[PDB]
Write a protein that binds this DNA or RNA. Structure first.
Ligand code: ZN
Ligand code: ZN
Lengths: 95, 98, 57, 168, 54
RNA sequence: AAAGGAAUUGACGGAAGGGCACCACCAGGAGUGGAGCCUGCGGCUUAAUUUGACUCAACACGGGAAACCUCACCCGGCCCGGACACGGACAGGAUUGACAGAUUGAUAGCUCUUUCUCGAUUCCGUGGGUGGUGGUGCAUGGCCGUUCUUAGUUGGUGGAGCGAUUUGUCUGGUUAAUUCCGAUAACGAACGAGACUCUGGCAUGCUAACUAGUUACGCGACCGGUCGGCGUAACUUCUUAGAGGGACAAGUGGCGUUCAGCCACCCGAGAUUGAGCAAUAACAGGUCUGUGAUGCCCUUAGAUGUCCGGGGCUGCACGCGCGCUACACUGACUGGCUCAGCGUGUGCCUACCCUACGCCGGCAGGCGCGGGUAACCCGUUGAACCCCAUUCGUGAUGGGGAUCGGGGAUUGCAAUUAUUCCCCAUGAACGAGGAAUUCCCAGUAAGUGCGGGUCAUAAGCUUGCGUUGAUUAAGUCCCUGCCCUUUGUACA
């Protein structure tokens, strides 16, 4: 879907920020809970993570109208290349 | 004048930890006034059993009891930290105010 | 019948129609979120910049 | 602030969603149940599993991932949650672990009867008094029916089905 | 679509303003004490919350 | 490619005999059925009057009391939330947003006219998918109802039989009960019943306490007394709630194969308190409309996804059922008086709360300072019926308050097809209901109110709480179902 690049790189920078991703099934929330500042919609995160899923870059669970997203190592090198990084910087799950 | 307030859903763990706390405070002999038994609040939700409403209309009755107690003591208010370190048994939770 | 879809209309190389060669060929939009190159379209009884949705006259 | 009743209800909903989510992720781990113990230095969440080596992932990746997702989803603060794995003594006396084991045997595929008799034989060899396993559904052909596999004795009514009988 | 008429209806004070907190249904809810589950999802997790038949 | 013989278990009968149950009658009570009204269902109309259910085991049932959402359903329109891969496109720009004006029901760049912003996320066809409260509960799970809460069900060693299988589990007595006694080729057991958990009934004996009370005081107020009127030290009777105790057919008389037990009566708080739980195993029972439980089929962009708007489920020559209100003098209407108890109370998601007291109105209400996350404030919960005096005088009357007009307030984005409330007006059958039938055995039926649910507004329904509180039975198989034994089969 046709979003700004800034909200998309804030979404991908959130996933590189902590390593995991949870959304709240929300079609109609105006703002994300963590991402109210940087102005991200929740539909942006959910369809951005489905575009990650449909190539196989994230592992998904859905429980109690909450999403869970677990990043593959294909996503680790992909977020080392799409987000532009020094090669010694690791996600917080590996520290 | 520090009052420790205990709350649980079962009576036996709460009775053991209230007995242990008054034994630890009667071994050091502060002024402790005894456990004051506040009345139990039953949360009852009476739902229907059947998921589509076809049968002979039998009804289902759930409940949960909340047992609410307290102990009140007069002491220095930093002596009081050393009694609430033995009370960490699950169920019962401790709220302290002065 | 049927309701038709909207296709993006194609004016061809209007990028030199923002200038006249030094001297611009259309008038400027006053803005703080826009500016430094942002002009208003001069229609026959109105004047139009896109982002502020501003009409003049 | 908030009531005593609404506090007890909302903590019960926390137990319900935590056990449901941990069942829905952790099929492979031997997940049987969770244990909360809350002290205000650190709030401690203890998972019951029979095989810890699939709980950790790669050098403990998924247990720190689990700490991170419980910190993110329930609104937990930065650094009040850490996550442990307790070893359960008997797999054959927990119905959730054996229910997952029969589920994994039948989902990876087997005869249904030799699966159920391996489960009944292991439960009666582990030291229980009794067992009952019903696998029902489209067993043989396209018409569904009940198939019951029992051994030993079982108590069925009264108050002692609440502490002598484990079900799943 | 337009973001001035799409989902412009008030989702305060409605039967569509509340739903089950587990299974996304709005019918036959249990609103008391902040459960907000429908009755079926009460009866699955009933002993897991602590509501016990006695 | 079996037709047939003998024998066992089961199902079934338009056979014989026992047993149980107020989902049976008998003793009887309140009723129902006839009457207006709320509400569900059958039809009838609609563009739609969505839908599942049709004997208990459908019809106040989907916790379904829908004004929008709900919401499926109709009329018209926006929307990708078609995720990825192959190819077309493309920085001479893939393309997102958009003012005025035609359009529309619309302040939908919806589209067309018109021509600015944005800059590789994005657009074009393929494949594959996604979404469904769309079907089929006759592909299914989970769960629930029902046979059935009736008292049934099964191993081990032993007997009988070549064998399927049988006895154990029965002629009888007894039990609420395959509960027991007794008879006895059976002896010992397991599940169900019972035990068990929760509640009710007792305690001057324990533990006891400014969020609970008693009482001896000290003072204030009123003509020894009254004070819920203001504050102190001893106690745990009243409140709260734990730990143990307690009732066991134990004591007595009688009946009784002197055995199970049954009946009667003292001492006693109490001599069947009530609910949860619930076996073998089955039905083509209901539910794909609780489900991101689902298998397949379906539709998938002039959608059965998804949103916004008017409409619908509420319609009525008409049935059937749950209910409410009454047909009055034990009453009605007006004043006074005095008493409860289960419980609810400021919310991740999210606007939605219990209300004291003072001022203004005849009401719903308006306005402000307060208290409360609860044994603290509403709250001594000053509840209704019942009680004590006034009037009415058997009349369709002052019972009945159905239908029907104008007005005021509250909720809400919005009350028309009146949501609710109050003021005034209007006075319909109905005078105690026929064949059939429903429910019930002690704090019971019934009379009467108060909390919870659903809820922005809220109960003629349901779920509980108490209050006033009886007649009648202490049994039978006549009726209605059901189980069991013997018996017949060409039925499995
Ligand atoms: Zn502008
Ligand atoms: Zn529920």
């Amino acid at each position: 879907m046709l979003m700004p690049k800034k909200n998309r790189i804030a979404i991908y920078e959130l996933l590189f920020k902590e390593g995991v991703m949870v959304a709240k099934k929300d079609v109609h929330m105006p703002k994300h809970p963590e991402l109210a500042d940087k102005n991200v919609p929740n539909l942006h995160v959910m369809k951005a993570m489905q575009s990650l899923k449909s190539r196989g870059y994230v592992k998904e669970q859905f429980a109690w109208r909450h999403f869970y997203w677990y990043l593959t190592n294909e996503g680790i090198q992909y977020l080392r290349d799409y987000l532009h990084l020094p090669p010694e910087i690791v996600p917080a799950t590996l520290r | 004048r520090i009052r420790i307030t205990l709350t649980s859903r079962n009576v036996k763990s709460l009775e053991k930890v209230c007995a242990d706390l008054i034994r630890g405070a009667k071994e050091k002999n502060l002024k402790v006034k005894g456990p004051v038994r506040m009345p139990t609040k039953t949360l009852r939700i009476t739902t229907r059993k059947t998921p589509c409403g076809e049968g002979s209309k039998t009804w289902d009755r759930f409940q949960m009891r909340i047992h609410k107690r307290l102990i009140d003591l007069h002491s220095p208010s930093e002596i009081v930290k050393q009694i609430t370190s033995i009370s960490i048994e699950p169920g019962v939770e401790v709220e302290v105010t002065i | 019948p049927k309701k038709n879809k909207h296709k993006r209309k194609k004016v061809k190389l209007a990028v030199l129609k923002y200038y006249k060669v030094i001297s611009r060929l259309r008038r400027e939009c006053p803005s703080d979120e826009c500016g430094a190159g942002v002009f208003m379209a001069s229609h026959f009884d109105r004047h139009y910049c896109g982002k502020c949705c501003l009409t003049y006259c | 602030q908030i009531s005593k009743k609404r506090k007890f209800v909302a903590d019960g909903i926390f137990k319900a969603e935590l056990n449901e989510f941990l069942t829905r992720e952790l099929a492979e781990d031997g997940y049987s149940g969770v244990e909360v113990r809350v002290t205000p230095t650190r709030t401690e969440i203890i998972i019951l599993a029979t095989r810890t080596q699939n709980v950790l992932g790669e050098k403990g990746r998924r247990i720190r991932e689990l700490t991170a997702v419980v910190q993110k989803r329930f609104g937990f603060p930065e650094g009040s949650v850490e996550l442990y794995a307790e070893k359960v003594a008997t797999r054959g006396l927990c119905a959730i672990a054996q229910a997952e084991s029969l589920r994994y045997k039948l989902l990876g595929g087997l005869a249904v009867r030799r699966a159920c008799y391996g489960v009944l034989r292991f439960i009666m060899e582990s030291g229980a008094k009794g067992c009952e396993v019903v696998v029902s559904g489209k067993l043989r052909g396209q018409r569904a029916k009940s198939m019951k596999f029992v051994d030993g004795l079982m108590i069925h009514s009264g108050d002692p089905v609440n502490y002598y009988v484990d079900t799943a | 679509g337009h973001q001035q008429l799409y989902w412009s209806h008030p989702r305060k004070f409605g039967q569509g303003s509340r739903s089950c907190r587990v299974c996304s249904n709005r019918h036959g809810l249990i609103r008391k004490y902040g459960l907000n589950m429908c009755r079926q999802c009460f009866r699955q997790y009933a002993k897991d919350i602590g509501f016990i038949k006695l």
